[PDB]
Amino acid sequence: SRYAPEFREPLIDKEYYRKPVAELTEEEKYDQELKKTQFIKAAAATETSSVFADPVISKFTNMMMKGGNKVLARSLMAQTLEAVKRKQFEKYRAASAEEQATIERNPYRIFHEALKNCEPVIGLVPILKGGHFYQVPVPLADRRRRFLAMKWMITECRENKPRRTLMPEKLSHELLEAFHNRGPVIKRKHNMHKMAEANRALAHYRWW
RNA sequence: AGUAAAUUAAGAAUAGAGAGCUUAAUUGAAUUGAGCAAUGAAGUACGCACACACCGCCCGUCACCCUCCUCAAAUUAAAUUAAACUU
Ligand SMILES: [Mg+2]
């Protein structure tokens, strides 16, 4: 890295800086005073104070990008969100007043609740004990649990789709199916959890 | 980490000749542990009949030639003795 270890990650929260001084906890108040005598990293090209920037969706975009084609990957995510909004508007208009209440037309809220439905609480680590490969039930961190949900989505759509279907049409159809706990990405989570019960007694081999 | 990946340009050398090489630029990620059971290294302790240094040293059965010794059925071979007393 070209940043020395003494550099601090930038804080790009607009409201945080403009809060009244008394509203800030003394711990936060102390850090701000310390940061005045430190070096701050430059903000990333994609780090902005925009009110429409969601870290979860921005991360999902980077996991789809191939060869640094951010314009294409962002376009694919923009087309997906729109394909989900247009799919719920059609259902909402073609539904009764009672049914209309339940229907969710926010694509950003369908994406977050979809991913969370696919996240697995426990995973598996492959281990070779006595020249035999065993996978031991592991408890997954918040970072490993989130990564696996996004990875499983980007892999079901990339591979298990018809040749002429497009990613905005497969991903939209999968975010909505996961949003209802019916999709194949949810089935992957159910299989992972079910296998952990099979290897329930083999967690002892853990050394880490 | 401006890394990987992807995409460009130029240069060396040639008369010409690389999908090779050198260099410059662009776009631009994911991830980094509740680590040491193992693998390797380092440190400490201990062991060593190894020092060619464990790809070490090393012990028995088995296999030819040669040296010495022992036992043993028998056979024969030479060797080796000592006196006893009568009249
Ligand atoms: Mg040439």
From Swiss-Prot:
One GO term (biological process): mitochondrial translation
An annotated Gene Ontology molecular function: structural constituent of ribosome
Keyword hit for Zinc-finger: no
GO cellular component terms given for this protein: mitochondrial inner membrane; mitochondrial small ribosomal subunit; mitochondrion
Keywords: Acetylation, Mitochondrion, Ribonucleoprotein, Ribosomal protein, Transit peptide
Localisation: Mitochondrion
Pfam families: Ribosomal_S7
N6-acetyllysine sites (modified residues): 194
Subunit-structure text: Component of the mitochondrial ribosome small subunit (28S) which comprises a 12S rRNA and about 30 distinct proteins.
Record-stated family: Belongs to the universal ribosomal protein uS7 family.
Name under which the protein is recorded: Small ribosomal subunit protein uS7m
Species of the source: Mus musculus
Lineage per the UniProt record: Eukaryota, Metazoa, Chordata, Craniata, Vertebrata
